[PDB]
């Protein structure tokens, strides 16, 4: 008296046109494949934009067994959406969450289990052009003249290989601490999701992960390698639709010895090729 | 089938001799000796170790001066179709008496008896019995002789015929002598 769903692919990723095939294992029963875009209302930023409501991507139900031992039964769905409705990338965000789930339920006089399968956006048409960016973290980067006076004199030079990043490829670059009067306690990368909901409109920025790249007083003139692996389901290609936007930024924050923090923001543009 | 045995005795190292005569070490090579019978007076574990590097079968009995006393006083070991009896020799009263050796072979009921207290080499047949006294390999002194020549005997046993090659160093020359024995 127990159910389980086994999706054929180990990685459980399926593209916008493939076929979702698997086996349901037991020890009448139906199975429903539902994809949802859950948008969570937030603190107002700008008529209260009361259009932030769940969006159903896909709805498909199969009556699998009409009303012992280890039993297995195959199943399959076609991943198709009319002619213009796109299957959004799986995205475990905070205010925008795009999730595809299979739900198997068996009636009794009802045992249910939900298993999530990932959907990957189709590769772009393809003219991938990296956009290398050079930057200089200086005391003239903090957006306050009042605090800037207490900042020790520092100068860091860096080069991001591309702000237009392939999501399967890591963010690579170099950072050279040309000269810092105060000892550098830590330099870390901070991937910040920028999620927007509604129209003329709630916009939030939330940290996904922090990855420290420089610990302690690094040699002055040594190229510390900026390396960052994008998280699997917490990052998606930059998505824009009339109801919601999901963008991504990276914040290089330098920490100095007397608890001083300096932020440089680079808006990335993730894509799949 | 040929069996090679090294009949030895009275090394007395180092109680009376520093080591074997220089040549006798050269004439003796490892991997070529099948048996090694010693009448005794090894006097050290070192001489026994030297013998152990010369063959695998090492039958050695107790002398009047052996450091290790676990040595059996009398030994009877069978090689080929023959049985050899081994004692040091100082048990016989008097030394080298043919009557005493005959009595000892009667007690042993053995084909051939080895008894080498008297360092002077002997080899004789009496009453269809074979008797070998190899003498001192290192030529250790004894009160019973004036000049002692180093000597050591080599059994060669084939079925029922034993040819004995005795190596004696006289002056600076290694004379070798042959004797023959056949079981009736």
């Amino acid at each position: 008296t127990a159910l389980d769903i086994k999706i054929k692919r180990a990685n459980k990723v399926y593209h916008a046109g493939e076929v979702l095939s698997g086996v349901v294992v037991i020890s009448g029963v139906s199975l429903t494949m539902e994809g949802t875009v859950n948008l969570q209302l937030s603190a107002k930023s700008v008529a209260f934009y009361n259009s932030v409501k769940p969006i159903q991507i896909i709805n498909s139900t199969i009556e699998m067994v009409k009303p012992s031992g280890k039993t297995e039964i195959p199943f399959e769905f076609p991943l198709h959406l009319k002619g213009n409705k796109v299957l959004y990338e799986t995205y475990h965000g905070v205010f925008v969450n795009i999730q595809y789930t299979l739900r198997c339920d068996m009636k009794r006089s009802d045992l249910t289990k939900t298993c999530e399968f990932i959907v990957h956006s189709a590769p772009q048409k393809g003219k991938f052009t990296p956009s290398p960016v050079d930057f200089t973290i200086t005391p003239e980067t903090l957006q306050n003249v009042k605090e800037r006076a207490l900042l020790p004199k520092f100068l860091l030079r860096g080069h991001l290989n591309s702000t237009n990043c392939v999501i399967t490829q890591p963010l690579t670059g170099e950072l050279v601490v040309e000269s810092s009067e105060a000892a550098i306690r830590s330099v870390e990368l901070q991937l910040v999701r920028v999620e927007t909901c509604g129209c003329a409109y709630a916009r939030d920025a939330t940290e996904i992960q922090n990855i420290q790249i420089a610990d302690g007083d690094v040699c002055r003139g040594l190229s510390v390698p900026i390396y960052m692996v994008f998280p699997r389901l917490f990052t998606c290609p930059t998505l824009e639709t009339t109801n919601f936007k999901v963008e991504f930024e990276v914040n290089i924050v330098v920490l100095l010895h007397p608890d001083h923090l300096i932020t440089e923001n680079f808006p990335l543009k993730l894509c799949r090729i | 089938g040929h069996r090679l045995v090294l009949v030895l005795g009275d090394l007395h190292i180092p109680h009376r001799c520093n080591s074997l005569p220089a040549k006798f070490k050269k004439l003796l090579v490892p991997g070529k000796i099948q048996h090694i019978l010693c009448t005794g007076n090894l006097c050290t574990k070192e001489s026994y170790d030297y013998l152990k590097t010369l063959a695998g079968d090492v039958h050695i009995v107790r002398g009047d001066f052996d450091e290790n006393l676990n040595y059996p006083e009398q030994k009877v070991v069978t090689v080929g179709q023959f049985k050899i009896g081994l004692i040091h020799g100082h048990q016989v009263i008097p030394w080298g008496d043919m009557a005493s050796l005959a009595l000892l072979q009667r007690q042993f009921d053995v084909d051939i008896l080895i008894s080498g207290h008297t360092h002077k080499f002997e080899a004789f047949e009496h009453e269809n019995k074979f008797y070998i006294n190899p003498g001192s390999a290192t030529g250790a002194y004894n009160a019973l002789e004036t000049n002692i020549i180093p000597s050591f005997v080599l059994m060669d046993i084939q079925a029922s015929t034993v040819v004995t090659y005795v190596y004696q160093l006289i002056g600076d020359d290694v004379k070798v002598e042959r004797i023959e024995y056949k079981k009736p």
């Binding site: 420290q212 390698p225 | 180092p14 048990q91 009557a99 009595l103 002194y141 090659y165 190596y167 002598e177």
Partner: protein, 802 residues
Amino acid sequence: VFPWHSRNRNYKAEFASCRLEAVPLEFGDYHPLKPVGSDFEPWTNKRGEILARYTTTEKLSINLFELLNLTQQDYVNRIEELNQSLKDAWASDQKVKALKIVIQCSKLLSDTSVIQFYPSKFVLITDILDTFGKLVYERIFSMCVNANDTAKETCLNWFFKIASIRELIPRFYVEASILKCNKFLSKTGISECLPRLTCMIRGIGDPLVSVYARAYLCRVGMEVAPHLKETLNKNFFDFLLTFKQIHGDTVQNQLVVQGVELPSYLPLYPPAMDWIFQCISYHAPEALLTEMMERCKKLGNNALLLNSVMSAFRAEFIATRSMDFIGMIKECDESGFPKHLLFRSLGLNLALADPPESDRLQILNEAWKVITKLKNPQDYINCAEVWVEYTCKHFTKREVNTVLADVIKHMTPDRAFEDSYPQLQLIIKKVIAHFHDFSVLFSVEKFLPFLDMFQKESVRVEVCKCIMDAFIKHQQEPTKDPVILNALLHVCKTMHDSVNALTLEDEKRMLSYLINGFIKMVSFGRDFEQQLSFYVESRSMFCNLEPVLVQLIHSVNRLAMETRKVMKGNHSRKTAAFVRACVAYCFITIPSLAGIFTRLNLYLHSGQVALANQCLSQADAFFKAAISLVPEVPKMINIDGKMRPSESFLLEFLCNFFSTLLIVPDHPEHGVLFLVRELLNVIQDYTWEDNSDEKIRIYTCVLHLLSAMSQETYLYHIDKVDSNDSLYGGDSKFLAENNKLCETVMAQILEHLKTLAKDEALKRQSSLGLSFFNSILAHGDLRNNKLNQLSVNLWHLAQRHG
């Protein structure tokens, strides 16, 4: 029973008739006797030294996820508990807990609260990482059996989880731990991940943490992909880029805050640079080693770097470039890493590979000019132990003498010996290892004063055993150079004075073997008197050890017989006194012996060697003393530490004594059969065991002896001693007395046989009867009617009871 008649025996005629004809052999006649690899030192070994040396007594703190005031042993126990928790969590299918435990353990490596404990700490925590690295790998391998999609998915999940780690040092350590798993993602995964980790290490700002991280990365690379050396060279180059930070301002301030002096902060670095350089220089081409050498030279305070250059590079490279390394050592700053450590490393290199011939004298001179200026005795001996090997291997005895004198000069003042008993031993061993001929070793003037340095008892005696082993195994001919004798005499004295009541028997055996090895090799040529002088000073010198006395007795008897053989028996007036002195020497010497059966056997051998020189009176004294000693034999004796009966040994001793007294003449002032008569009295009076019948065996032996001696001519004779056969000339009275003794012995034997028959022990009675019949057949004249009847009766009695 019945009287005895002796069968006539003609020994010469019987031997001639029974002698087998022998055919000599000419030349040409056939007689049988005719004619990563093993060169890579693994991290497992270095584990022990790093853990042993780097120990701190300060209270440590292990903060996870808070614990304070922990000792080193408790710190190790807590790390072992963390490792066991890792293993249990993995075996319980809790992989996330395993990952978090490994992450925290790696986090511990980012803390430098106690600098002195960092190396050993690095060795402990890394073990957990290794335990992680294998334990993950097997799992994917367990899924493998270009692997299946499940194994690849698990491997990618692990790599993503590890790539999600925030702190840099934990991320690097955990990711490098599972570098092997990169095999399951692509054939180029390791070749694409190793350079990235090497570059990632640049983020570590603390020099010590970065250096040990580089060491771990090199270890993982060599135990995973040892064919990617081109990638790992970047570790050495980036390390040289970072080396400026070791002596920089930030680290100095950190040490000041922790209150740690630089002379103690620096020696924490070699454990990691040695590994880095060894991995990077393994089978490297000479061009790469050269380039590393000049890149190390061009820096500043590179005194530390040079050490690793000697500690890792092949011995040949450093040996050829040894003069340049001397030059580099010379300008090193004194306040930094010690210079004597660099000199020790260089000397260790020169102990394996020889330097160029033209430079050896300059190298030795410039090394000793710096070594002799050290003030601390301990590091001085650390250098000198290493460099004595070089001085003894390449140069002559004069330089060895100078080095030994310098060592003595340094260590004598402040009783420093106690701190360097082991090292000094090593030195002395080396001096003996390269000086085989002992006419040269003891020509070294300061060799004996060096032995005088070891004033402790246990330490000194071991060096003496080493000297004596070297002498016995490197001296194949007798020597006489008085320098040799006096020196070995002193060594044997100072080794024999260690024998006391507490000394074990095995120690006494080993010491006796060594002093015997010395004594055997002193041969005074034809100067027999001075050889006896050596023997008397030896007995006075080596009194305590019994086997030395035994060997001395044997050797003085050997000298007596050697004089006999040299003079061909014709004793001279001058040499009669010498042989009498030798035999009196032996007479004095035996009674001192402790063992009993040894005393008896040596008394006999002394007797026989005594009669060999026509000197009869003291020989009779020997036999009388032996007889008087006979009753002291115990029933139960000691053999090889165990306890064994003394029955058969007593039998063989008496048998030998009888066989000897065959030839011994009887003094005219006394009666016939004299010594035989007292021996008979003693054996009759001996407290023989009730269940023992070897006494009648000995009476049968008595019958054998008297029958043999009743013959006209004895079987064997002494060179110039008139035995009873020639003294009495077969007198009728002597034969009658012998026959009366025969009747007495036979009456005793028959009485014993009757007692055995009355005792109902028929097996022993039958054996006795058979043996007595065999004896009668041997010697008893069967022609006599009474003796033949007695033999027939004995045979019938033996056959009656089997």
